[PDB]
Amino acid sequence: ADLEDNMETLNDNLKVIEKADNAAQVKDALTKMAAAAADAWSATPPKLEDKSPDSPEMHDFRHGFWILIGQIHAALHLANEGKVKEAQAAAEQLKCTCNACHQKYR
């Protein structure tokens, strides 16, 4: 799927996590977030569409999703352990990473 589908999957699961009640909610939402970020790896954003795929901006772009997935999986670890409040806090902290990349390349 293209970047646009995947981003809007990222945003919706962040909200599912916020108005979540039980851990299963959060686990599934976090799992789907990790896949959407992984799926967005191949995409080239429009402002980088004239860059070559091994440029410093393009590399930082992909690296950003790699950091996001590491952060998603850590929150997924809190969800697996039944820590619903913590995973939700961890899910809200993800938008340092969402905003960082939007600022630079969106």
- Measure the CA–CA gap between 55 and 66, rounded to whole angstroms: 16
The residue type at 90? A
Q: Is residue 2 a contact residue for a second copy (CB under 8 A)? A: no
Residue 45 contact, options ligand HEC, a second copy, none, Cβ 5-8 Å cut-off depending on partner type: ligand HEC
User: According to CB under 8 A, which one of 3, 16, 35, 48 is a site residue for a second copy?
Assistant: 35
Note whether 48 binds a second copy by CB under 8 A: no
Nearest to 37 by CA among 16, 2, 66, 79: 66
Residues placed in the known binding site for heme b:
7, 102
